[PDB]
Structures are given as structure tokens and as C-alpha cells.
Design a protein around this ligand. Structure first.
Ligand SMILES: Nc1ncnc2c1nc(Sc1cc3c(cc1I)OCO3)n2C[C@H]1CCCN(Cc2ccc(F)c(C=O)c2O)C1
Ligand SMILES: [Mg+2]
Length: 208
């Protein structure tokens, strides 16, 4: 059973801007996703100080980057806090609406795409390089869900029956045809070194 939801207008506009604006420095998408993973890992870490039981779903806190040329996907996996169904449908868009308006304020008033992360909506930079984004996520006390969107104003949520995750998030980037460079090891390495070198969690770049 797949449910289909409309993005809030403001979020749909943001996604259209990202997809349509001429902007050659597409590589910033990876730092934004890794940053989001790091924040999610911080979050489970501090929540589990006043509730150790939140770590029963997994104690390891790390990030995997997994390229698959056969599927043409780049997956950013973390064991962070993950996201509830209530997050995926409502709470994320509630928070993102304000940060989206600030970001588009600055885009005309002293800014370029590369500061999208300072307004909490860096996730949507994924559409610089991905034609479709699939997000698998598992939060404590909720089930595992698959969120999916190829933009166009809508997204889907379903219960995930695939490989169970324990706790965390997988962002699966289905790369555009002309963006397979982000499957190449040298390229991913270069980008992580340039923009993500001081993240306080292990980042494992899988090979192949
Ligand atoms: N890898 C990750 N792991 C865990 N969360 C992740 C995460 N990547 C992101 S970005 C994102 C991802 C999406 C999405 C929209 C956004 I934009 O639609 C499908 O996938 N988020 C959402 C965070 C980003 C920063 C802002 N918060 C606000 C917020 C709302 C409700 C809450 F309970 C908390 C706690 C919270 O912080 C949400
Ligand atoms: Mg929305």
C-alpha cells in the first residue's frame, strides 16, 4: 500500500529551483547529506544520555557511502536517529517551510545555492544530481518506511519490507544520466576530503 502526498507549495518551489537553476558546482550535495547524517548521529547520541535504552537498536554510530554502477545509485547510510512516519508526512515539511523561505530570501539578497545547508534544507540539494531520491528510515518506536520522490510536486511513503535496518537512514540517490561521476571512487574521495574532512564519525567509502 503506497500513499501519495503533495509537497507544500513552498517545498515544491525549492525543488524546482534546485532542478532548473544553472549551477555547475553540483558536488555540494554530498557534504549536505553527510552533514545531515552527522546531525542525526549527534541526535541519537544525546537523546540516549537520558535514555540508554534508545541504543538497543544499535550502538555503532557511523556513515557509509555505497556506490553501485549497476543500479546507478549512490547511497548515504547512517545509524542516526532516523525519522518517524509523522516526520516524513508532516514534521519535516513544517520545519522546512521556514528554512526554505529564508534560503530563497538570501538567494536574491546575498547568496548562492552552496549555503542551502545553513537553513536546514540541504537535503533537497540531492536533486542537483538525482532524478529520483529514495529514503529508507527507521526510528525507535516506529516502523521502517520508504519515502520516495522524483519531484514534480509529490512524494510517496510506504512501509518498507526490504532489509531491516535496526535504526538509521539510507538516502538512495538515483543519479541522472550525466552525473555518474559521483559513482567513481576518486571523485567521491576528492569531495569528502574537500568538504567533509572533520566529521566526528567514521565515514566508510565502499568500493565498486
Ligand atoms: N539522515 C537523516 N536522519 C535523520 N533525519 C534527517 C536526516 N536527513 C534529514 S534532511 C530531510 C530528509 C528527508 C526529507 C526532508 C528533509 I529537510 O524528506 C525525505 O527525507 N533529516 C531531517 C532533519 C533535518 C534537519 C531538521 N530536522 C527537523 C526535525 C523535525 C522533527 C524532528 F523530530 C527532529 C528531531 C528534527 O530535527 C529534520
Ligand atoms: Mg512538504
Amino acid at each position: 500500500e503506497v500513499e501519495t502526498f503533495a509537497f507544500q507549495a513552498e517545498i515544491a518551489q525549492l525543488m524546482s529551483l534546485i532542478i532548473n537553476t544553472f549551477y555547475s558546482n553540483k558536488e555540494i550535495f554530498l557534504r549536505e547529506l553527510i552533514s545531515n547524517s552527522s546531525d542525526a548521529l549527534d541526535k541519537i547520541r544525546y537523546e540516549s544520555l537520558t535514555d540508554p535504552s534508545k541504543l538497543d537498536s544499535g550502538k555503532e554510530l557511523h556513515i557509509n557511502l555505497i556506490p553501485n554502477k549497476q543500479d546507478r545509485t549512490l547511497t548515504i547510510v547512517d545509524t542516526g536517529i532516523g525519522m518517524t512516519k509523522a516526520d516524513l508526512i508532516n514534521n519535516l515539511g513544517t520545519i522546512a517551510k521556514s528554512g526554505t523561505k529564508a534560503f530563497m530570501e538570501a538567494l536574491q539578497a546575498g547568496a548562492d545555492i552552496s549555503m542551502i545547508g545553513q537553513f536546514g534544507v540541504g537535503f533537497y540539494s540531492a536533486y542537483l544530481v538525482a532524478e529520483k531520491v529514495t529514503v529508507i528510515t527507521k526510528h525507535n518506536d516506529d516502523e521502517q518506511y520508504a519515502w520516495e520522490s522524483s519531484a514534480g510536486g509529490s512524494f510517496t511513503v510506504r512501509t518498507d519490507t526490504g532489509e531491516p535496518m535496526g535504526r538509521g537512514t539510507k538516502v538512495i540517490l538515483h543519479l541522472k544520466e550525466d552525473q555518474t561521476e559521483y559513482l567513481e571512487e576518486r571523485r567521491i574521495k576528492e569531495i569528502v576530503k574537500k568538504h567533509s574532512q572533520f566529521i566526528g564519525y567514521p565515514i566508510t567509502l565502499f568500493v565498486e
